[PDB]
Amino acid sequence: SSSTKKTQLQLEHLLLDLQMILNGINNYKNPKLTRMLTFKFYMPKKATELKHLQCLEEELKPLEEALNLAQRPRDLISNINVIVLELKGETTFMCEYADETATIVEFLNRWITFCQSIISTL
Amino acid sequence: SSSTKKTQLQLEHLLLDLQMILNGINNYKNPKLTRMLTFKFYMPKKATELKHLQCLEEELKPLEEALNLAQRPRDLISNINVIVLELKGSETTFMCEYADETATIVEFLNRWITFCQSIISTL
Ligand SMILES: CC(=O)Nc1ccc(COc2ccc(-c3cc(C4CCN(C(=O)CNC(=O)[C@@H](CC(C)C)NC(=N)N)CC4)n(C)n3)c(Cl)c2Cl)cc1
Ligand SMILES: CC(=O)Nc1ccc(COc2ccc(-c3cc(C4CCN(C(=O)CNC(=O)[C@@H](CC(C)C)NC(=N)N)CC4)n(C)n3)c(Cl)c2Cl)cc1
Ligand SMILES: [Zn+2]
Ligand SMILES: [Zn+2]
Numbered sequence: 001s002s003s004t005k006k007t008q009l010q011l012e013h014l015l016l017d018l019q020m021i022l023n024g025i026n027n028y029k030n031p032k033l034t035r036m037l038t039f040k041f042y043m044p045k046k047a048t049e050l051k052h053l054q055c056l057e058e059e060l061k062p063l064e065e066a067l068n069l070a071q072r073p074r075d076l077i078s079n080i081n082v083i084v085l086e087l088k089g090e091t092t093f094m095c096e097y098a099d100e101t102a103t104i105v106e107f108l109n110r111w112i113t114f115c116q117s118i119i120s121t122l
Numbered sequence: 123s124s125s126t127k128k129t130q131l132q133l134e135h136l137l138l139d140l141q142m143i144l145n146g147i148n149n150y151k152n153p154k155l156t157r158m159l160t161f162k163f164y165m166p167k168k169a170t171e172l173k174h175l176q177c178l179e180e181e182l183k184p185l186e187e188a189l190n191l192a193q194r195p196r197d198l199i200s201n202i203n204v205i206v207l208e209l210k211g212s213e214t215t216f217m218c219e220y221a222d223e224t225a226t227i228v229e230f231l232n233r234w235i236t237f238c239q240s241i242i243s244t245l
Contacts, residue, residue: 030187030190030191033191034187034193105157106154
């Protein structure tokens with residue numbers, strides 16, 4: 001299917017954007033890296049299907065906030081938003097968050113692993 | 123003697139402090155441990171005498187920086203610093219020699235735990 005190729009490329013682009021954000025974070029100087037690891041993110045309890053991307057969508061505003069403190073973030077997050085919303089679509093899904101919060105590093109990596117998990121199935 | 127007893131206790135204190143930190147790191151979750159293991163440390167080529175503790179002293183700030191990412195580290199490293207300064211004591215300033223291969227936090231701490239244990243057991 002042609003639409004399956006659309007889902008694939010969109011997942012590849014989202015994976016790349018998250019990898020790019022993380023790459024810049026890994027190169028931060030010691031005092032800067034320390035301060036951004038205090039910014040807490042909500043994590044998914046389950047992330048095996050495309051509908052679970054609602055957990056990412058809801059956490060894009062904190063992500064835009066964290067990137068603003070460490071610096072364009074407004075434009076980059078808006079681009080990711082479009083892809084995230086398009087990738088999940090049916091009506092409205094309630095997202096279940098884990099008890100323990102994580103840092104930007106664990107947050108990004110989880111969603112990077114999520115994207116890699118779906119790409120391989122199609 | 124009263125001089126050797128003090129040296130023994132202070133060496134056993136440094137050993138305990140490093141073992142306390144090592145217990146903290148090993149207790150971390152797998153994903154947290156992964157990022158902790160990328161923080162690289164400088165290792166001593168020769169560590170046989172009390173004056174070789176300068177290779178630990180210089181690496182004490184990098185240790186504080188690592189525990190700040192995993193976060194009190196400001197007071198604990200300061201406490202360790204005092205011990206090192208009292209043990210290496212003297213007025214002699216020994217210039218340090220470092221090995222080529224860098225090591226993780228676990229390998230760094232264990233090497234100095236090993237250093238402590240070896241000095242204690244020969245006095
Ligand atoms: C000298 C010079 O200019 N150079 C220089 C270079 C770098 C730096 C360091 O940069 C920074 C400086 C400051 C910060 C920072 C962080 C913060 C805090 C960290 C903690 N915060 C948070 O965790 C906010 N998150 C939420 O609201 C959560 C809470 C929920 C989990 C309960 N909600 C959701 N995720 N949905 C709030 C923001 N502030 C106010 N400032 C950050 Cl994140 C960086 Cl990266 C400083 C100076
Ligand atoms: C759970 C999960 O997946 N994420 C997750 C969640 C939270 C945490 C909290 O703890 C941490 C979180 C993140 C990090 C971390 C650190 C780092 C880097 C690792 C590489 N760095 C270094 O090279 C540090 N080393 C030095 O500065 C050396 C240089 C030497 C190599 C020549 N200096 C001297 N010895 N003189 C700089 C810091 N990143 C990119 N991420 C670290 Cl080290 C810890 Cl301990 C860790 C991981
Ligand atoms: Zn805020
Ligand atoms: Zn003590």
